[PDB]
Amino acid sequence: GPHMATGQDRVVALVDMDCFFVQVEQRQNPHLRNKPCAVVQYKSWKGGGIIAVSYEARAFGVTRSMWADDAKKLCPDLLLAQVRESRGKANLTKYREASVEVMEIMSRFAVIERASIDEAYVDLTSAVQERLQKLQGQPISADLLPSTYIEGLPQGPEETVQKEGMRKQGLFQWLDSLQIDNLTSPDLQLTVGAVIVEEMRAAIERETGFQCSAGISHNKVLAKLACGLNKPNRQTLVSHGSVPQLFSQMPIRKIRSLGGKLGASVIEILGIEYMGELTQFTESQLQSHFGEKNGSWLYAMCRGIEHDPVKPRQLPKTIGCSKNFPGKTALATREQVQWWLLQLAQELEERLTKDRNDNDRVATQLVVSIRVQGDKRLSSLRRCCALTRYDAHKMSHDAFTVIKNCNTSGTEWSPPLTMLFLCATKFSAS
DNA sequence: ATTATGACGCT
DNA sequence: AGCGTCAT
Ligand SMILES: Nc1ncnc2c1ncn2[C@H]1C[C@H](O)[C@@H](COP(=O)(O)NP(=O)(O)OP(=O)(O)O)O1
Ligand SMILES: [Mg+2]
Numbered sequence: 001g002p003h004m005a006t007g008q009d010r011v012v013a014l015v016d017m018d019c020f021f022v023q024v025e026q027r028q029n030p031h032l033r034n035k036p037c038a039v040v041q042y043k044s045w046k047g048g049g050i051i052a053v054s055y056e057a058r059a060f061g062v063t064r065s066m067w068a069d070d071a072k073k074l075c076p077d078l079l080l081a082q083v084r085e086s087r088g089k090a091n092l093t094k095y096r097e098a099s100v101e102v103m104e105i106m107s108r109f110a111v112i113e114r115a116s117i118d119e120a121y122v123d124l125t126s127a128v129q130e131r132l133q134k135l136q137g138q139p140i141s142a143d144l145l146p147s148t149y150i151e152g153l154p155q156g157p158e159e160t161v162q163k164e165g166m167r168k169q170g171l172f173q174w175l176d177s178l179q180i181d182n183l184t185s186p187d188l189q190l191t192v193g194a195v196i197v198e199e200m201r202a203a204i205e206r207e208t209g210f211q212c213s214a215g216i217s218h219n220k221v222l223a224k225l226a227c228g229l230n231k232p233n234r235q236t237l238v239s240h241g242s243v244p245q246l247f248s249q250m251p252i253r254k255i256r257s258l259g260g261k262l263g264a265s266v267i268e269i270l271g272i273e274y275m276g277e278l279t280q281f282t283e284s285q286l287q288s289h290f291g292e293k294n295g296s297w298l299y300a301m302c303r304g305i306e307h308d309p310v311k312p313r314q315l316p317k318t319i320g321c322s323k324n325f326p327g328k329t330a331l332a333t334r335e336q337v338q339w340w341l342l343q344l345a346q347e348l349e350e351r352l353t354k355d356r357n358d359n360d361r362v363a364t365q366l367v368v369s370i371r372v373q374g375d376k377r378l379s380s381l382r383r384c385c386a387l388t389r390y391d392a393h394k395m396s397h398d399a400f401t402v403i404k405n406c407n408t409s410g411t412e413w414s415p416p417l418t419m420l421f422l423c424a425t426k427f428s429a430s
Numbered sequence: 431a432t433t434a435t436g437a438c439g440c441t
Numbered sequence: 442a443g444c445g446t447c448a449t
């Protein structure tokens with residue numbers, strides 16, 4: 001009892017931007033603000049593919065992966081913004097630069113781990129300790145947490161007919177219970193972490209004009225889950241004590257890393273649907289079905305416990321460019337293949353050169369991946385070679401050299417390629 | 431014809 | 442080294 005770890009050692013948050021690519025386009029074009037809007041790529045086929053959707057547009061049922069022509073059927077007044085196109089492919093530079101704006105603000109507060117173009121984990125354990133020392137015995141006011149939800153509250157016994165009324169009542173219950181006394185209560189630490197995350201979210205909105213949501217908990221999985229509970233423009237605190245009720249009706253697929261085959265297996269092999277049901281199995285039983293690492297992870301995670309560290313990494317480990325060639329457009333000639341490789345290499349060269357100037361590093365390996373027609377896998381084949389010069393002509397020529405014997409017969413290229421992907425990796429200081 | 435592209439585990 | 446999974 002006295003010796004059972006409860007996974008309450010850290011304070012971790014996950015900050016994720018709300019409808020991020022849309023906000024980027026709305027900041028730039030004020031006519032799009034506060035309107036049902038989506039961002040699309042490649043307008044020629046079915047009006048383009050939607051990759052981001054404003055919350056006003058979601059209310060009509062518009063979603064990612066939907067065709068714009070189809071989205072317009074659900075939402076006639078839907079406004080659209082097109083992703084920039086360069087060299088015949090989508091160019092996501094505008095969103096990467098916007099991402100940098102936000103990541104640089106978050107880094108001021110604590111160590112972060114970039115997790116995607118629009119989210120990062122934050123390890124607030126040290127910052128909370130410092131803040132706790134800064135205010136001795138200072139009780140925490142509700143005004144310090146104007147956009148925070150406490151998951152699981154309010155509980156027990158009219159302002160609650162509306163959502164802000166629920167939020168405030170739950171926050172009051174939580175704050176009324178908190179003992180400022182006792183610098184080591186995990187609940188107190190989370191609360192101070194939440195205050196700091198309000199400050200962080202305020203700074204991002206002030207300095208970039210972008211709104212975001214956040215989750216604060218004791219580990220990355222719970223912080224990520226918490227982030228999505230009250231999006232948009234709100235933050236949610238998930239305490240250790242909230243986990244049994246929260247996990248009791250939480251579908252297994254909603255937990256990070258369980259959204260694929262492993263999660264399906266868990267459900268299928270154990271005959272359960274919710275994360276909390278995992279507690280009735282022993283660690284050995286879970287290890288026997290899903291392996292040593294997965295079994296141990298599951299046994300601790302269904303109890304709200306996870307030890308994956310927030311890595312101190314702001315910069316991407318790899319830099320890559322890819323393009324799909326669906327259906328009839330699959331590449332069928334040598335020349336075609338070489339031209340598209342050159343286009344990808346030119347974009348890559350730009351991004352690498354910038355990376356070298358900004359971050360004092362150079363990539364040393366080039367990985368080329370291709371997908372052949374009829375193959376469902378992301379990558380049909382991967383090959384690599386040395387990246388010794390940031391030269392687009394050398395890179396595209398070397399990439400062709402490494403995959404040219406994949407061609408069964410021809411001038412002609414077969415089987416046709418439905419994807420080309422160039423990735424620069426193995427960075428070293430410069 | 432659900433795209434562009436990341437991190438990282440397994441062998 | 443090369444492939445498979447899970448992810449936004
Ligand atoms: N499958 C995909 N393919 C291409 N781009 C994608 C993508 N999923 C996301 N993006 C791009 C476009 C997105 O804007 C961005 C962030 O991904 P989220 O955080 O998953 N989604 P958002 O921020 O939009 O809304 P909110 O978080 O409020 O739910 O990455
Ligand atoms: Mg987001």
Ligand SMILES: [Mg+2]
Nearest residue numbers: 016116118119
């Ligand atoms: Mg995200």
